[model samples]
Target: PESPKGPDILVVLLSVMGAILLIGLAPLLIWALLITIHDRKEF
Candidate 1:
């Protein structure tokens, strides 16, 4: 007999990772923008 738990766990793991990435994206964008502006001023 095959178990359904394997797929359930995979789905949960992917959901957590996706949530983390989405939450972190805003901060990452701000960091990139700051670096870009800083570099522009230096050059």
Candidate 2:
């Protein structure tokens, strides 16, 4: 059977990375989304 320890460590590392990116990029993502929607409006 495959080892569980390695997979668990990898999962924890990836989760931390995802959390950090979320904290860092949320503002930029919201701005980009607003800009995209604004550009898509009808005349």
Candidate 3:
């Protein structure tokens, strides 16, 4: 009898999702921060 190893799949799936979230959000967050700082400096 063999048991299904589902936990490994879950871990890999979660890691992939986290990487995607970081990849998508990191650039946007940095861009927003730079714009805010520039506006403050200009004003």
Candidate 4:
């Protein structure tokens, strides 16, 4: 039944979204942070 499969679908969707967000955003966020510090001579 579709109702029985809802939990599995939700788990899969959440996992994919979390992974995508991390891979897509982590590098750019870190780069921006590093750039800010570098601009201030912190590193």
lDDT of each: 0.81, 0.84, 0.81, 0.82
Error of 3 at 40 (Å): 3.0
Give residue 19's lDDT in candidate 4 (0 to 100): 94
lDDT of 2 at 29: 83
Give the lowest summed-lDDT range of ten residues in model 1.
34-43
Give me the displacement of residue 21 in model 2, in angstroms: 1.7
Which residue runs does candidate 3 get wrong by more than 4 Å?
1-6
Ten-residue region with minimum lDDT total, candidate 4: 34-43
Give the TM-scores of the predictions, in the order they appear: 0.46, 0.49, 0.64, 0.56
Clashing pairs in 2: none
* Candidate 1 segments whose C-alpha is farther than 4 A from its true place: 29-43
Q: Using TM-score as the measure, name the better of candidate 2 and candidate 3.
A: 3
Q: Of the candidates numbered 2 and 4, which has the greater TM-score value?
A: 4
The alpha-carbon RMSD values of the candidates against the true structure, listed in the order shown, are 3.1, 3.0, 3.1, 3.3
The pairs that clash in candidate 4 are: none
Distance from true position, residue 13, model 1, in Å? 0.2
How would you encode candidate 2's per-residue C-alpha lDDT over 1-43 as one tens digit per residue? 7788668779989998999999888977888779778876877
Model 2 C-alpha RMSD to native: 3.0
